[model samples]
Target: SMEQVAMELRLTELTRLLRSVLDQLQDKDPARIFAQPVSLKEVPDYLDHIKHPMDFATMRKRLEAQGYKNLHEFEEDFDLIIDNCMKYNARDTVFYRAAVRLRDQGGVVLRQARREVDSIG
Candidate 1:
């Protein structure tokens, strides 16, 4: 019962939060979030959006507005969404590699964020 309750709560809260996030992105026009002929792109802004913490609200709103209606549907061990923050920083391969290597050292950020949700104190 505890497991079921926990799963249900996470599912409900996550869905609601993501729905709101998607709404915000839609209101602001998701298309302009990126650029074409991107010479005008600011590097930090580009990185921040893609690889940021992306709270549950952020994921829900984007997914819902993009027509991911059935939140109950899925059969995978994980929903893998790699952050594309550093994608535009294409100047140096070694630097990117180093950044990735450092990232690997601090693994599973989402797990840490969720600890607060089940907090005992």
Candidate 2:
């Protein structure tokens, strides 16, 4: 019984290593890859853009406090929000709109960071 238990433990450790590799290579999106339910029609009043009231100064300070030095770092969290929106069908709601607002704002921050880097070089 001891020998069997030891073998199982070794197998589990080996499997855990392999599982990490598999997870790394796994496709992030099955729906997009398969092209399932892909049809788009413009929603009424949805196309009209509205400015999102965001506190960019506060957001920038918050990101800095969190040790985000560039847009890529901020985008890591932004991608999580997008993934949740996709999972929960938040595309037509204010949630998705807010996500877009952050995305656009992140782009602005990224460009500023890029310019600063270029200037240093």
Candidate 3:
């Protein structure tokens, strides 16, 4: 019905939200290291150390392919990317510190998104 269509944007809303989150966060990284794939050749032992390897390359692909079903799934991947860097790099390293900042802003981004559309929903 008209009400149903208005009430739920379904994929359009989720896709827009995901794109916003990805676009904004990736820009924040000055070095743009997070934007690159953590390929085995570049970081020889990266795959060996982390069981679940997620990268910005895959992140963009998922966004375009509409890989997320709901906000729950979106949150899952966001945390995975954030968690990956924080775990792989030590506290003293750059990526670790970068991820901490990323996570801080990341939470804020998600909150605003929820408030923006979720309020209408």
User: Whole-model Cα lDDT per candidate?
Assistant: 0.38, 0.41, 0.77
Compute the lDDT for candidate 2: 0.41
Looking at model 2, which ten-residue stretch has the lowest summed lDDT?
Answer: 30-39
Model 2 residue runs over 4 Å out of place are: 1-71
Instruction: Spell out the clash pairs found in candidate 3.
Output: none
RMSD of each: 10.9, 17.7, 2.8
Which lDDT tens digits does candidate 2 get at residues 57-105?
3333444343443335444544544444444446787645655554554
Tens-digit lDDT track of model 3 for 1-121: 9877754567767788778877877776767757766779878998777888776778788878877766777777777887988888899998898888888877777788778657645
Model 3 regions more than 4 Å off = 1-9
Task: Give stretches of model 1 more than 4 Å off.
Answer: 30-121
Name the candidate that leads on lDDT: 3
Order of all candidates by lDDT, from best down to worst?
Answer: 3, 2, 1
Worst 10 residues of 3 by lDDT: 3-12
> Which of the two candidates, 2 or 3, achieves a greater lDDT against the reference?
3
